[PDB]
Amino acid sequence: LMQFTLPVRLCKEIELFHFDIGPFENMWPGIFVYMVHRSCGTSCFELEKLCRFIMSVKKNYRRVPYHNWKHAVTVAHCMYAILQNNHTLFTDLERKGLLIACLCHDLDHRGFSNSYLQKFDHPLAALYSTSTMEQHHFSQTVSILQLEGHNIFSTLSSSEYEQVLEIIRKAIIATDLALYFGNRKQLEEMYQTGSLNLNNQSHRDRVIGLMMTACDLCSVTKLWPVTKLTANDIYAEFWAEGDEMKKLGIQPIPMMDRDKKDEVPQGQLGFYNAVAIPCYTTLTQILPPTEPLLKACRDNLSQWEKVIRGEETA
Ligand SMILES: Cc1cc(C)cc(-c2nc3cc(NC(=O)c4c(Cl)cnn4C)ccc3[nH]2)c1
Ligand SMILES: [Mg+2]
Ligand SMILES: [Zn+2]
Structure with missing residues (x-):
């Protein structure tokens, strides 16, 4: 068999939650296959269809400051770390579905929020009245799966294929931050009343949703220099959107x-x-x-406070 292998430094540090995938685009597909071969196994997907699928996905991400191809692999890497450190808790199909959901979770993002699509009256807002972009991302994922030589799930039964597609759909919709507040509240009560049951499928759904929020925000869990540099790219998009709100004659939020x-x-x-x-x-x-996600989140909170008190610049 052919095992994907990484340089020594990458091979060690990719296991850390705070790993940065680095600035070489041409290495990210290799990093993602490695993470799939070690978290799912080398027999999960035909290597040739995975590679065709990876490159079609890359090609349908856009040249935007933050919601781009690098974000997709970064979020997938955070899921890899979670799965490797909790390996006894997940099914065969969940391993298969979640790294793929992470890679596809922002397909065809133009750098604008669901709210701007509503104020603009974009046609996607007529098609999908809530979680507008997230429903588009999923639809884009299915398009890609149905391209010739691209069905990476070809070996699954008809019913298994339907389950794995349902895992992917839910995990992607969960990245709509508007739904996160509700989902986390529900999970906090369920934890603190002892009702939370990982054998309960609608509970599993909520936990995976939270894992997707955690992965989608994971820039706040990196070393401070990554965290600070990544925040320029986020505000770059946010401010382009606010400019567009001003052009509609609307005051953007702060x-x-x-x-x-x-x-x-x-x-x-x-x-x-x-x-x-x-x-x-x-x-x-x-x-x-x-x-380690929460620890590094606190460290970076403490850093933002240093910046407010003028002991650090940005
Ligand atoms: C200039 C200014 C003024 C005022 C009053 C508020 C903000 C302000 N900045 C905000 C950033 C986020 N979110 C993120 O940074 C984010 C996401 Cl989303 C994912 N990862 N990260 C890191 C959410 C709410 C935010 N309000 C900014
Ligand atoms: Mg998104
Ligand atoms: Zn995202």
């Missing part, structure tokens, strides 16, 4: 106004308290080995 550039450290602080810390806290309670 995070999307490039005039409020100096309030970023405080906005970050707000985001960590209201969203990130709660997310990684609830995930640590449910999956104790994910601890």
Whole structure:
């Protein structure tokens, strides 16, 4: 057989939750196959169809500052780390489906939120009245699966194929941050009343949803230099959207106004308290080995505070 292998440094550090996939685009497909071969197994997919699928997916991500091909592999890598450190808890089909859901979760993103598509009256907002982009991302994933030589799930039974597609659909829809608040609340009560049951399929759904939020925000869990540099790319998109809101004659919300550039450290602080810390806290309670995500989230919170008090620049 042919085993994908990585250089020594990458081979060690890819197992850490805070691994950065680096600036060489041409290595990301190789990194993703390696992660699939070690988390799923070398017999999960025909190598030739996986490669055709990977490259069709890459080709349907856009040249946008943040919601691009590098984000896709980064989110997939965070899922790899979660799966490797909790390997006794997941089914054969869940391993297969979740790295693929992560790779495809932002297909054909143009760098605009669901809210801008509604104010613009984009045709996708007529087709899909909630989770607008996320429903488009899934639809794009099915298109790609149905290309000739691209059905990476060709060996599955008709009913298994339907299950794995249902795992993928739910995990992608869960990346709509508007649904995260509800999902985490439900999971916090279920944890703290002892009702949470991983053999309950609609509970599994909610846990995987939270794993997708954790993976989609994982830039807040990297070393500080990655975290800070990645925040430029995020605001680059947010501010282009806010410009577009202004063109419609609408005042954008604050995070999307490039005039409020100096309030970023405080906005970050707000985001960590209201969203990130709660997310990684609830995930640590449910999956104790994910601890290092929350630890690094706290370190970076502490760094945003240094920036507010002028002991650090950005
Ligand atoms: C200039 C300014 C002013 C005010 C009043 C607020 C903000 C402000 N900045 C915000 C960023 C996020 N989210 C993220 O940074 C994010 C996502 Cl989403 C994924 N990963 N990350 C890291 C959410 C809410 C935010 N409010 C900004
Ligand atoms: Mg998205
Ligand atoms: Zn994303």
